[PDB]
Structure formats: structure tokens, C-alpha cells
Design a protein around this ligand. Sequence first.
Ligand SMILES: CCCCC/C=C/C/C=C/C/C=C/C/C=C/CCCC(=O)OC[C@H](COP(=O)(O)O[C@H]1[C@H](O)[C@H](O)[C@H](OP(=O)(O)O)[C@@H](OP(=O)(O)O)[C@@H]1O)OC(=O)CCCCCCCCCCCCCCCCC
Length: 1335
Amino acid sequence: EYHGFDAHTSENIQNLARTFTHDSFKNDQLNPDSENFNAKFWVKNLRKLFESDPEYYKPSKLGIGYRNLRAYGVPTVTNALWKLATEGFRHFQRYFDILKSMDAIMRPGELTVVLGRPGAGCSTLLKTIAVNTYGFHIGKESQITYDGLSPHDIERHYRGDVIYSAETDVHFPHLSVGDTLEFAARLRTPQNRGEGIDRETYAKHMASVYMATYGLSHTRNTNVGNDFVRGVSGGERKRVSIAEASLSGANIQCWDNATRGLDSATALEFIRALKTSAVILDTTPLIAIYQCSQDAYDLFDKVVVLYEGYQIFFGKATKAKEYFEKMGWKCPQRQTTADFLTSLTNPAEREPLPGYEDKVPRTAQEFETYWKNSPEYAELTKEIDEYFVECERSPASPYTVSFFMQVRYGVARNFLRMKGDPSIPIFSVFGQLVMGLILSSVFYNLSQTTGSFYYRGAAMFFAVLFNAFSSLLEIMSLFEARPIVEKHKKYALYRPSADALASIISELPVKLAMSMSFNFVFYFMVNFRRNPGRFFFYWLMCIWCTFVMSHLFRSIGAVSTSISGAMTPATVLLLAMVIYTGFVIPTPSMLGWSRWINYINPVGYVFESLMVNEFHGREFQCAQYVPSGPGYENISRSNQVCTAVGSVPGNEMVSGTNYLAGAYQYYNSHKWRNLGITIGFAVFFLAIYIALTEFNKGNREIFFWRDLTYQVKIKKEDRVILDHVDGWVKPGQITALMGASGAGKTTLLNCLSERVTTGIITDGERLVNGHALDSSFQRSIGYVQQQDVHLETTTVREALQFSAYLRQSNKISKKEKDDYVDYVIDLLEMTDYADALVGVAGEGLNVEQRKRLTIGVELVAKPKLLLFLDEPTSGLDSQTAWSICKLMRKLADHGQAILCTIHQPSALIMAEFDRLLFLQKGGRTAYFGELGENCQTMINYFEKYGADPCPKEANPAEWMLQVVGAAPGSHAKQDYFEVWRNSSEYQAVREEINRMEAELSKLPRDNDPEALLKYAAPLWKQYLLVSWRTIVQDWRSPGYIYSKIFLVVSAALFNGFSFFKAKNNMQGLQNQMFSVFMFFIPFNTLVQQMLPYFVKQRDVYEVREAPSRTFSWFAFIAGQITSEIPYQVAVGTIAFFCWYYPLGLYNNATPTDSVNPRGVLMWMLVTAFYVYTATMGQLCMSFSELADNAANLATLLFTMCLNFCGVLAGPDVLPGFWIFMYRCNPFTYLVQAMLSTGLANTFVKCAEREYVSVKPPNGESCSTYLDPYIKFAGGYFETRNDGSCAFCQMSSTNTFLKSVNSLYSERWRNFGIFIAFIAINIILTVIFYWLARVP
Ligand SMILES: CCCCC/C=C/C/C=C/C/C=C/C/C=C/CCCC(=O)OC[C@H](COP(=O)(O)O[C@H]1[C@H](O)[C@H](O)[C@H](OP(=O)(O)O)[C@@H](OP(=O)(O)O)[C@@H]1O)OC(=O)CCCCCCCCCCCCCCCCC
């Protein structure tokens, strides 16, 4: 533990200094070897001395003195657009005072405490001290000085000399404490002239010395961790943050609620660490707290008390109590001074002294008037004026090290973090390699004949994609490291630009590894050009493409806030770049309005360069000559011709350059220019990213138990947790249940309520009115959890109504349920905000209101036996806890039985209970009986059995814990379990229990046949209510439906209008097929957006709803599945209307007069695809825990399905191994149905550049020579008035459709199969959620 710089800390510092000076070897009070030397002076002087002092001014102590300070300040998505319009009008074109006049002076080396109720303005005061005025303004008359400086100077020049970090202790979870402190140590070491001392050794010595000072020595080489990741103790992370802040040379530190959610034994340690920092390093700490112990308060020096923004006192912490006693108020006995000061601002509390009632302030104005009139204010004003006079009488870059070394240290820390967790790099590299292998398997050993042309094209396009999107995952790191960077920017350690540059540099090894592992496999598995120079140029182009894409992704991520928030707008841009690469829409077929996009497309140039590199100067053997078949067996090669874009009549080989110049319109003069253009793009995007990251940042039954014994199996060893604990509860009596940390009071509470999934009961017996527990027990009790888990959308009344409907008995009419909900709302004093959205804890209902809501939710179910409460008064201030205790007292008065577990209470709250049950270590009962008034009964019981008397001003809870021996540093005279066993009152307890069992057993039972039911409401009602609740929650989500609609509409519109009124030439059909292929890309983004709103529902259900037996698991999963169907259907209809019609696919149905069937079928297919997207996302999220893993798995499976969907390679070309994956795939049937419906039964008109020239035999006509082939296979011909024939190979679209294995007569069948797949998905979900999460 930590006891604040004791002898052992001094000797540790002595040893460290001895080792350091011995290492450096290779007056009397500074030499470690000599005696008469103490570590205090060494630590104080190490920062200043032992380092060359820059000529500039860098203060070593800041005391702040301010006078006349004052600060003032100023939905359903259907209404979201109107709200946005109103906000825009507000942007286009009264004052509320939060802090009133106040005076204060704070010298260096004094720890100051700010006291006040929540919302009193302490946080605003601390923000004003730390110059964090953003969000409000300060009056012009206020005089603020920092040892003679000004707020502007501190904000501009000496930033980092005053800091502010309130609750969120942000650290890299996977970085060791030693490394985390060494980072700041090295980044704060000045350079000047380092001769004599090695900088690295000095930084290590500073890190070790400050670790020893704050008692973190044992924590070295241990993960700092986070609330999720395991690591150092929660009480040591705060000390690590203090050590880091003080190590970066922060003079004035301000903390608020830093000790929130921490027990007294650790809040004391935190306060002690602050005190040592103040007294050794001479810093100025300010701390704002609500729950303070007397011992912790004894360490403070100056206290400032706030009352509704009015400063009522400021001075020595010891004199505040005397001053407010002179005021005329009375402090109740056994009340801590901090609690008294806080309660002095509560109208319910603060009972005046006798005789002082007539003259005593009652409102903040009177308090401030007296404070101003008091002589203490005069003395304070005199001191402040003297300080101002003294200050008046008496570095361009706030950072210390130069930019290059900031970048170097950022790179080093990035490498340390990567080595600490080799998950993202290794997984990314191996996933890339495996996906590359699988993809290349489709294009294995492309042939050298012209028949491979198309495939080669595809083989390049996808390559450009894989190198393009290889580094997409890297942006995730930016979101993990964003908070820390901001914090480190505030401390004035390194600019965010340095961090961005270091992040770019540190990922180069991973980019190199991925590029090698993917290209060296893909380029050679697919038989591209074998010339070494060609491969090297391909690798160079791919490397620069991935650089450009990585920088673009980083630039996008620099302004976003989440993966989904970045993906919603980024998907449209990425699709725009992908479609216009030059393969989906070759340049000759690009529309006029989109030709300009290709100019500014950084990926089109890469594709052009790669294709020019491959095809240029290459001769391909012909694979098919247009005149051929049984009719033509012996025809001179002169009359034939190859079926390629650049084919020349009578030539056996087609030239690659002609094909490129004719089909894609690329030339070899652009091979090298495009490399320069891509380098320019990379540099531009790097500059944009750096600029962005630099700038854009900112009850008749009685329940009892007898001889309960409970043991748990751990490490194959049986240890008893509860050893024969007996007790009872009664209506109208509150039974507090307390114990040490290891006493397992929570274990007893959970065991009594049957909420434990582990262990068995050995000897006990639980009885209700003398009868054994039946199956109706679990529904006849209420359980109020410590943590309040509620949906962020449903209002208070909606949540209460939902619980009432789904939990009360079915025979009760709806009107009675609503009446009882109103009664509960009235009884809890909740009427003020009965229609206020719960929302996140930050914005919405505060802690007290949330706790009241939870108690109401558990109450509306109408428990008949008991109401367990788990730590109701933990994590709340001293006033909210009192309010909750009063509410519990009222509930008990109304006729309820309560059994609550209390942790670290105060005397006043403790006085409000009727019975006490104390558990020693190991679950052994010490005392069990009424504690009387002011805990007199328990004190008398313990004293009369050989215990020291309780001090008059001691808190009974702490004294009890100490006498039992659980308190640290306390010795027990003898164990009290045994003395309690034979105490003359344990006999009374036994007699009472036996009498209750013998008498209450004769009371007639209330046999209700509906009670003995596992769930109160029938299954269909639960399913309907859960589905409606989820639908409403999605509707009210803050911009979740709008993101989905925008994404889908934008993608569909871009896809439709890129091929606007597409023609039906040979390349047109391929363009439309790839349009259908690219229609599916929004799948990944839709899944990513949808999953978190499933996570929220799952967490709420599992944490609270499931154990409470509100609705069955099947109801939950079925509701989640049915919730997304309506929104998906609507979005699919919108997408079809925005894609099918602009594409002009309806014209294809005009000749056959089948517009309506082919339109309805297409709409049904599109909606089915979207419903399938939702079902697949939910399935892949059913069994996994994190949303990221489910989204990644869904994307991987979707990509695998797309690879073998039949467009990239049909069944014949596909290797046999993968043939099964071409049949089990759910997208092949969808693609076939869509193509057959949209393209079948229409004519084909070949473009001018795709006609093939044929030279018929001498003395023959085009018809006479080509009719047999035309009959044998489709196509048509024209006369060119030059003796030749211009031939087109396709006359009707049915030929191409048959080539893709899509038939018009089978579309319906295909559609049906797809529906089956959706069905399967749903079924699997309803099964997997049972195997994985249901216990
Ligand atoms: C911080 C990020 C780090 C990123 C990594 C950094 C990378 C920086 C690298 C800088 C190195 C730059 C080297 C550029 C020098 C090119 C010298 C040839 C210039 C030229 O111009 O050579 C054209 C002919 C092919 O050109 P070609 O066949 O398409 O057409 C011509 C013919 O070559 C022919 O020779 C006739 O005339 P020429 O001789 O060319 O004048 C005519 O032929 P026809 O008209 O009859 O068809 C035509 O001109 O190169 C060929 O063969 C293939 C030869 C490979 C071309 C690049 C060399 C290898 C790649 C460079 C580095 C590889 C990757 C780097 C590491 C990877 C990962 C660590």
C-alpha cells in the first residue's frame, strides 16, 4: 500500500540515487554515499539542477490569485430535419450567471479542496482555473493572475504549466507503466548541452524516482490497462495519472470527481499522493470531491465552499467548522466536517442551533452577504491585494524537444504498443495472404490466348482493389489513440502533427509485409508477364497505390469520430473511385457527365499504368475465329478473323497494344506519367491529413432462512463462502447487510435471491411463512441492481409501462396497470420528468434520477415477498445517498420489506435502518439484531462482550469494522464469530426462528394457479411488445435511420446514373452485369451500422431483463430479427426505385410486353437482398461478443460469397475444388435472377469499335458466305462498301445470358432459392443465440 513518502520510500530513493551516480561515475546534503542526506532535497533539486537551464523563462512554481471572478453562460428523426434547419438558422444569425463574484488566493505547495453539491459550480471553477474557458465566457472585471502572468500567456506561451483531467483516466491499455512514465520523462528532458550526463539514463532515473515517490515501484513492467483490459488495480491507475502529470512539469493541477467510484481506503491514498506531490515538488493541486472522510479531509489546507454558484467561505480547512459554528448552525455528532459543509447547503438539512433560528442565513444571497461582511473577507482581500502588488512589482514553443525527436519518440512508442499487442498486424497480414491465395485460386494460370483477355482485366482490377484497401484497418488505431494524443497535446509534450507523422512512419513495416505477402503470391499464381522488370514495375505501382489509399483513409479518419460515422459518407466516395477505375466502365463507354471524375480519380491512373505495362508489346494467339463450325472445315486463314477488339483480319495473332487502344483506350505513353500523378496524389493527401490532424481537433408473507451454508469449487478445492448464516426480514423493516470486502455480503444477497449460477447449498433451508420455496419465488421478489442499465431512448413512463405490462399478472386489465404506473411515479416524486428520455448518463437523467427510475421499474412489477437492493447508496454523493435512504424509509413505511447491502456508509444514513446483519471474513455472522437509535444497540453489544469503547465522535461503521478486524492496520482481540455463537442472543434468534416456523406454518396459503408460471405474459405478447420497443428505439435513435437512408440512396443513385440509359452493345452487357455486382457493396456498411444497436439491446436484456424473468430468450431474438425487416424493406424499395429505373432496364421488357412482371420481380429481389443483408448481419452477430468481430466476420463471408458469385469466373473456369462454393453460395442465384429479369429477350447492337472485319472468298457475297454460321450461332453482319463484312457476334441478349449461366425461364426458381437462404439464416440465429449466450 501507499502511506505517503515514509522512511522506506526515502531509502529506496537513496538506493536509486546511489546506483545512478555510480553509473554516471564511469554538498553534504546531496551526496548519496555520505549520511545526513534525505531524498526530499534530491527529488526537489533533480528537476532544477543536474540539467542545463535554458536562458528562457520556465517557472517552477505557480500560485494563482483571482479577484472578482465571474462566469456566465447562454428527437424523432422525422423532426431531425426541422431541428437541423433551426440550428442552421441559429448559426446564420440571455446570459445565465453560473459563477458569481468570488475571491481566492492559492500559493504553491498547498492542497486545495472545492466543496459543494452537484451542479453547484465547482467543476466550472476548476475549469476556469485551468484556463479551459471553452463553452462559456468570463467577465471583463475579473482580475486573474498566475504569479504575475495572464490567462492569455498561460494559454499561449506556458501551456502545460496548468492542466485539467477530471474523471476519464485515459492511458494506452497495453503499454507498461514503466514505459508510460519513461515516455513523458524522455519527452520532457531538455537538450541544451548534454555534456556530462547521458539523457537516457537521466530519463530512466527520473521515471524510477517518480515511481518510487508515488509508490508505483511494484507496478513496473505491468500493463496499465483500462476498465475493460486487466492490469494494475483501479486505485493505482489514478496514481499513475498523477505521476505522469507531475512528471511532465505541470505546476497547477485541477481534478474533479477524480475519486468517483472509489472506496474510502483508496480515495485516501489518492489524496495522500496529491499531498506528497504538493509538499515535495511544490505543485499546486486543486481537487473537487463530494464523498470525503474525516481522515482524508484532515490532509487539506484550503477549502472553498460553493452554494448555487455563490462562494460562501474560503480559508484554512480547520477554521471552516469554527466559522460556520459561529454562524449559528449545529453540527450533529458523528458527522464528518466535509459532510457538514456540504449539507450546510441543503434546505432539508442544516438545523440551526438553539437561539440562532431567528438570525441565520437561509438563501445563497444571505450567505454571500455575510461572507462579504465578515472580517475574514477583509483579511482575504488585503492578502490578495498584497499578492497582486508583489506580482506587478516583479518561449515561442511550449514544447521542450524539437520536432524530429518528437517524431522519433512517437515512432518508438508506436513500436512498443505494437509489440505489446501483436493482433492487428499479424491478423491483417495473414488475412491478406489467405485472401490473396483464395482470390488467385479463381484466376489460376490464365492462358496466353485471347480468350484470357477479359480475365486478365479482372485479375488486375481486383488486384488494384486489394492493394488499395489493404490498409483500411489501420484507421482503427487512430480512433484508439485519439484521446491520449489530445491529452498529451494539453500537457504540451508533442504536437498532434508529430504523432500523425510517427503513426505514418511506424506502419511502414506492416505495409511492406502485406504488399510483399500479397503481390509475390498473386502476380505469380496468376500467369501475368514473367519479365522481372515488369513484375517490379507492377510492385512499384501497387505500393504507390496503397500509399495513396492509406493517406486518403487517414485523412477521412482525422475528421470523423467512429468507424460507422466515417464509413457512412466515405462509402460513397470509395464506390465512386472503384466504379471509375477503368474496368467496370471502360473509357469509351463513360457518359459525358462522368468523364471528368476519371480525371481526379487516384486509382484510375494506377489501373491504366498496370494494364499498359502488361498488354503493351505482346502478341496473343487467337482462340476463336469468327467463321467456323461444321460448314467451314477447310477455309483459308485469310478469310477468317479473330474475335477481339483490336483484331486485324487475316492475322493469326492479336497485338496487345491495338486491343488496349481500342477497348480501354490506354496507350504506352502514359506508363510513367501516371506514376508521377499518383505520387503527386500521395503527397497531396499526406499534406491534407497532416493539416487536418493539426487544426481540425477539439407484504403479509415473511421470508427467512436457517443454517444457510454455501461453498464454491475453485481450483478443484471446496471453500465455504457462507458458514451457517441465519436471519429473517419482516414487512416495514429495513435490514442492512454489511461485511468486509472479502466477507461476501454480495454473495449472500445473490444466493438468497437465487441469482448465483455457481456453487451448491449444503445445510441451509430457506422458508416463506414456514413452507419450502416453490417455483413462484423468483417472480415474487424484486431486485434493484447497483448499476442502472436502461435503454437510451425509452422515456421514464414508457419504461415503467413496459415493465408493468410484461411483469404483472395477465388477469389485471391495462387500465389498472396504467393506474399503478401513475401511482409509482407519484410515490417516487418522479412527476417532474415523467416524460424525459433516459438517454446516456452524460446527457439526460443524472445518478439520483436513474436510481429512482430503477427502483420504480422494480416496484411496478408488484413484488409480494421482498425487495433486495444491491449497494443502493454506493457511487452517490452525500446528499443523493441521503435522498435515496429517505425514499427507502418511505417505501418501508408503506408496508414493504427491504434487505439492502450497504458499503462504506456514514453515521446519518446508518441511523435510518431498523436491523443489521454483519458478516465477518469468510461469511461468518458477527452481529444480527436491531441497532437501535444512533447505533446504540450494536455499540452496547460489542462493548459488553470485551471490546474497546466507541469514541464519541467516531463513525459507528468504521469502529465496528475495526473492532472486528477487517479494517487495515487493526488487530482483533479475539474472533467474534465464536462469541456470537454462544452469546445469549443467538439463542434468542434460534427461538424466534423456530417460533416463526412453528406458527406461520398454520397460516392459510394463497394458492393462485397463475402465480406458478415461468413468465407472467404469454409468449406472443412478449414478442409483440419487444418488437415494438425495438422498432421505436431504432426510430428514435439519433440519426441511425437517416445514415442508412443516405448511404443506400447515394450508392443506388450513383450506380444507376453511372450507367444511365446504358446501351446493349457487347461491352454494355458486361458493364450492366458489373453494375449488378457493385450494387451489393453497401452490405458491409449496413452491417457495421446495424450491429451496435443490437449490442445495446443484447446488453440490456442479458444484464437485467433475463435474470428478472421478464421475457424469454426466444422472444428477445425473434423481436430483434423482426425489428429490422420494416426498415430494410423500405430502404430496399427506395434503392430499387433509385437504381432500376435510371438504369433504363424497363426498355428491355417493352418488346415482349412484360414490363410489370419483370419490374415486380426485380423489386422483390432487391428487397430480398436487403432483408438478407440484415439477417446475415444478425446471424454473424448472434454468437460473437464484440461488434467489431461480428462485422469483420460478416464482411469476410460476404467477400467470399462475392468472389465465386459467377461473374468473375463461371463454373467451367472455376477450379473443381471451389465448385461446391459456387452452388452453396446465396448470391449466385440472386445474380442470375437479376440478370435474367433485367436483360433477357432484347436485341443487341454492336458498337462501332467492336465490329469484326471479314474478307469473304473471291466471287462471293457476305450473306452467301456467312449465312450458315449465322444460323449455327447468333450475330449479324453489314456491308461496308469495301468488299468486306462487318460482323457482330451477338444478335440477342439471350446469348450473353446463357454464357453467364443465367436463364430467363428459371428466374422464379432462383428467386425462391434465395428466399430459402434467408429462411435458413433466421433459423440459424434462433439456434445459435441459444447455444452461445443462453445459460
Ligand atoms: C516511401 C515509400 C517507398 C516506396 C518504394 C520506393 C520505390 C522507389 C523506386 C525508385 C526506382 C525507380 C526505377 C525507375 C527506372 C526505370 C528504368 C527503366 C525505364 C524505361 O523506360 O524502361 C522501360 C521498360 C519497359 O518499357 P516498355 O516495354 O513498355 O516500352 C519501351 C521498351 O522498354 C523498349 O525498351 C523500347 O524503348 P525504351 O528502351 O523503353 O526507351 C520501346 O519499346 P517498343 O516501343 O518497341 O514497344 C519502349 O520505349 O522497362 C522494363 O522493361 C521493365 C523494368 C522495370 C522498370 C522499373 C524498375 C524496377 C522498379 C523500381 C523499384 C521496384 C520496387 C521498389 C521496392 C519494392 C518494395 C521494397
